[PDB]
């Protein structure tokens, strides 16, 4: 785009670590400081990345004959911010790609999707949603998969299996590696700030979020029938870091 | 094409940001002020990033049995400028690219399309129209698309469904990322000043648009027929931003 | 090539539009000025950048049974100079490549050709002819397109169709982004000039052309049967553009 | 995702190199010490190289009618830290990517995976599982392969075979070049420290794995029938290095 | 090459453009002279650029049932020496190079070849010989082309067409793009003489050609038939350039 | 990797070529010492380059009706060192990889691998075996072909031939361009030294090897069968090369 | 591989430029002396650059029934060195590479392969064969063709014919263009030579060769049979060159 019309400063940079023990869920803010004279504002490149644990365990079971499995559907990313506040969210990487094929039709579906939420002046969210998985190499099942007969097959291990339901699920290994040990959003974001602010100082919101979802599976006496329920528990990891834009820096 | 033929300045910028609440329609006018001694003109790359939101709501529904949905069906982006004002276009990115293809037949075709309307010396202006999506993994449906039993199937999730109309509507991330949570145009056109002109200030027009459908379904007791009308309603973002290139900046 | 061997100035640009309100075509004459000590002539990188409007419009109709569409099939840029001058063309780009296939055959051909017409030292100049364009997505049809019954399928929106012919005509949009809303020529020439040239000035003539065919189209009382006669109506957006070599610049 | 946005130190290394000779396990834990002054953290990049052996060797043998095979079918690096240590780990290569495929249905499966245990602020860990290996040219055969007639068909040279069961095996240089002469982890992850830590140094503790398979195989007078034990026996090598960031330097 | 064994002045140019309007040849001669302190040699790279017309035209033609179509079938650029001078050649792009294919048996072969005739210490030569064209879609035809009914289908528009014979011939735009509008060489070669050599002055004979070919058509009362005499005419346009090796400058 | 977290001295060369004119193995030893100050210890990049002879010969043959063929089967390079000596390599160059394919199976199989032997703190080394080779473009054979009647097929040139079997076997060159005329090892092999080391001087140990195979071939009277004792005969070329660290020098 | 392991002078050149005006054998000894401080030995890279004419012409006929051709099947290139001289051969480019293919199976064979025969450290020598080539579009046929009736159909234009055996040979253009005008080698060899060696001069042996084939055909009074005899006539040029290495120059 530049070459195609002909067309031919110190930064402040830093990282702020924190970890919730109890959800598991990594964050990372890494950061930079960036001032230039001929550019009329401030500016600060905020990078999302980081790793949300996948805890593809079996929460519990009720006996042999039926057993449940709390594993995550779709990850998030929503660094929300104050209306209040005067902060400006710029530009976001990455944005939301036109879809591309060929015509018989054919194309690419990953399995986790990176869509990116209609956003604001204040708010800019992603959503990593589970698109589709492969079982047993047969079939992309995805979260909408039901049988009369045979039930949900997101993780069936075999369908006319004989071994106890909390040791009959598929293994998190031979799936996907998200779901096993979990998904890494390395996503970025810049928020840009007035020249001549009065109050150099805003308050970042980030919010790592992720879908549990509660996939009770049990015995039909013939076959292994699994029922879904979406959204069955969510963790949200929020969190507010302050900036110092006259000092150039952001602490926890 | 420059090594072809053997053949082997201060630029100040700045960012403007302003949001639509009504509407919910992102505006960024990122832009670049370049001047040189070599060439005869001024310069003012402006680049058109920001995004359009899609707002995929139900906005109403006539009961159970039959049910609207508010989607868009283009965008667009037209920096026009008064016929008044000497300010000229020079050069615009994208540009209309020949379409290609291989001889049986086949041809890629992006869900929305590029499109650039033909421009002036004082407006340009593009169209990212819909040209054809695919639901249930079966058919690229465009708006044209009828049938004289099911009707439209642009976004009907179930042919046989027997769920509400307002809940039986196909789920919009299973769609492209455009419609469910906005598209994000990211254009770009270069205007061109007279060296030597006496006011050294114009006008610039930034119209975000979108075409906005209304698709109305309901149940024929058999199956589930849409119809949509084009154009139903249409929502434009215009803004006046002036610019001051004697001091080579824009503000609001 | 300059490497398979073993083997490893102050330049002046400028710009200058002009637009034809009538026939609504963009002018881009964008150059930059080249001197070199090692070289014995004097250059000059002529850029040929812009626009061309298509106009695929409804020009006029003869009724709902019989209507005519004006559209542009063929254009051109031929930057011709008189055979008195002595300002010499030496290269130019894009040059005639030569054709490539696989051999069962098959291999690639755009939709809108880009020729380059036999110059010579005077008179450089293209030829963007229409090679064949896809509708209904079956079959190429290009201008020779006939039939016996259906007579041309070139922009016949429906076979037996019931409609106005004014208003079954195919979507411009649905077909290519160059007759719709034009096609934007960007091409490329050098001339050079003597270094001991008495008068370091010439005459460059720009001539933007275009050959708009009349595709008259009715109802045989069955299908719609459409004619085509080439070249019917041309337009032409001639411009003599004076150098001065010897300040190194150009102007209207 | 820099330039997306528009957007545009003395470091110590070294070297520490150890060897196991009982489990034969190669050691490389090449690094380099960084500081930034526009950084607020101390760095350090940890490299992981190295390789750990293969060891495909008839580690015993029951006549020539019972045979095992000791083999490698899951190695790991587990780079932990004690969660006393205020020891942060920031971010770590490879991050697990989305899995991407084509739709009939196809993608690429390697076989031996690299997966990334859902780390924390203390411990990051891979782990190289085996997933599918094809024996000869026929069927990626993988871990949980069994016949009820053939049994496991893993590494058997032989289906009908009539030689010894210790020498029927199939030759480790026809699969893949991991299991027979070992396999080179090459990986890495970066770890933080406070700029105005009070102590300078930590326990960087670093443990080398893998899990030796035992593959039981004897005749069942018409074929070879083999049964795997997964986790038969592990070969743990952990090692202690401390890290003196006031020096930044870190020895055994 | 260089780094695979782990191996790591002021040059006078200028060009000379001539035309023949009798042939309309066009003649480009872009050089460079280059002389190198460690090089025991003056070498001078000359381009061969420029391009040849086709003049696919009906040269005349006996009456509607007989015509006769001038089209060229072979251009060549044979920069040729006089065996006295001692000037040397020591290299020459492009170079033949071998051919490559997959093994059922596929390959690419272009319509224009462009082959390098064997040449010697005095004489380089070229010859850009016609290999195939596919005519309807159907069929690569080249010159050896024939029918005992058809006879030629070189240049048939139409196999039992009812038009004239000189207007029943194939559009010129719609074969390739080199016959029609010309063929531009591209080409290029260094010579090289002695340092001490005692006249720094040798005689560079440039000699544009052509093999136009008389393709008689005519109509067997049934279909056309033609045939195609090769080497019918022939034109030259040669030409003697002087070079001043001791001022590194060449002249007309 | 470095740049995935965001992350953005003399040396001395030398040469030394020694050949074993009974074997026939050539022999290069590239190298290069390299210093640090960040660096804790001391580095030399050791290039396994040269190459070994194929000696694709009939080395004897008991008369016409039964013949044996001497033909290489591996290229063993271990250069190793005493473990009395404290010389730690550190890495070398090429790694072993991890296998891919596709999923219907397909993958890539190199006729020759480059295999790497389980090495040690002292001892690295290759070993080139063979893999499998086609023969009449007819089946990619492998050392371990064999048939009931026409036997091995590894160099049958003819299957039912009549000619003397010292004149019936297959062309060297219609083979694989390795056993007729040889490889060529082009490794690399890096090993680090103590910076406070004692004794600056070690002993380098290359032994360049070889597996050539006795291919015995006979006529069954009907078709010719053969037989291959795989590492029938071994030749080595051990060589001892002594470095000065203290001078930065390796030598004979 | 440099990069792998994470690690990060004044030459001569010259010209010597000679010809076989017998044989039409063109030549070029393209060099370039290089000498570093840190390499132990000096080092001259020798560039192989020239080319070797083709001649595939009818040396002569036996009456219109039968007719030979004199075409070549293997041109060499032998850099050959007598043994009583230290000069050293290191490294030469190319280096015979592994072959690769996908397994149904599929490979790429050119039709000039280009060996490198099994030097030594005094002779350095290519062997430019001839592999496959096709004829008529139908098998790449090989030297070895021969049919029962047909007999070798290497050239035969016509199966069936009934033209003159000297002027029904195939077209030399038709077939690849290495045979009609020529092969081009493009080698290259380094040799390196002691520090302080005493006599800083040897003499390189340049021996461009040929081998032609005798190709009779003749009529059967059905069909065309020809015979191929290998090696039929070799035209050595042999030229020895001497280097002065204490002036880093090479002459004649």
């Known amino acids: 785009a530049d070459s195609d019309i002909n067309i031919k400063?110190?930064?402040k940079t830093g990282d702020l670590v924190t970890y919730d023990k109890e959800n598991g869920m990594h964050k990372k803010v890494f950061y930079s400081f960036i001032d230039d004279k001929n550019h009329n504002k401030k500016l600060l490149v905020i990078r999302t990345k980081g790793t949300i644990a996948g805890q593809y365990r079996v929460y519990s079971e009720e006996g042999a004959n039926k057993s449940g499995l709390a594993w995550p559907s779709a990850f998030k990313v929503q660094l929300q911010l104050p209306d209040n506040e005067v902060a400006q969210i710029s530009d976001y990487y990455p944005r939301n790609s036109?879809?591309?094929?060929?015509?018989?039709?054919?194309?690419?579906?990953?399995?986790?999707?990176?869509?990116?939420?209609?956003?604001?002046?204040?708010?800019?969210?992603?959503?990593?949603?589970?698109?589709?998985?492969?079982?047993?190499?047969?079939?992309?099942?995805?979260?909408?998969?039901?049988?009369?007969?045979?039930?949900?097959?997101?993780?069936?291990?075999?369908?006319?299996?004989?071994?106890?339901?909390?040791?009959?699920?598929?293994?998190?290994?031979?799936?996907?590696?998200?779901?096993?040990?979990?998904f890494s959003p390395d996503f970025?974001?810049?928020?840009?700030?007035?020249?001549?602010?009065?109050?150099?100082?805003?308050?970042?919101?980030?919010?790592?979020?992720?879908?549990?979802?509660?996939?009770?599976?049990?015995?039909?006496?013939?076959?292994?029938?699994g029922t879904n329920t979406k959204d069955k528990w969510t963790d949200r990891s929020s969190e507010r870091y302050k900036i110092d834009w006259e000092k150039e820096e952001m602490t926890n």
Chains 1, 2, 3, 4, 5, 6, 7 share one sequence.
Do not use: C
């Not at 399995?111 to 949603?129: H, M, N, Q």
């Not at 100082?201 to 980030?206: A, K």
């Open 98 to 182: 036109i879809d591309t094929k060929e015509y018989t039709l054919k194309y690419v579906q990953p399995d986790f999707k990176t869509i990116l939420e209609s956003p604001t002046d204040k708010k800019v969210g992603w959503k990593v949603i589970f698109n589709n998985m492969v079982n047993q190499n047969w079939g992309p099942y995805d979260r909408d998969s039901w049988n009369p007969v045979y039930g949900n097959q997101l993780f069936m291990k075999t369908r006319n299996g004989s071994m106890k339901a909390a040791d009959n699920f598929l293994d998190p290994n031979k799936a996907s590696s998200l779901l096993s040990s979990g």
């Open 188 to 225: 970025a974001t810049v928020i840009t700030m007035d020249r001549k602010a009065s109050k150099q100082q805003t308050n970042i919101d980030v919010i790592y979020e992720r879908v549990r979802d509660d996939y009770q599976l049990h015995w039909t006496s013939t076959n292994w029938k």
């Open 9 to 11: 400063t110190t930064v």
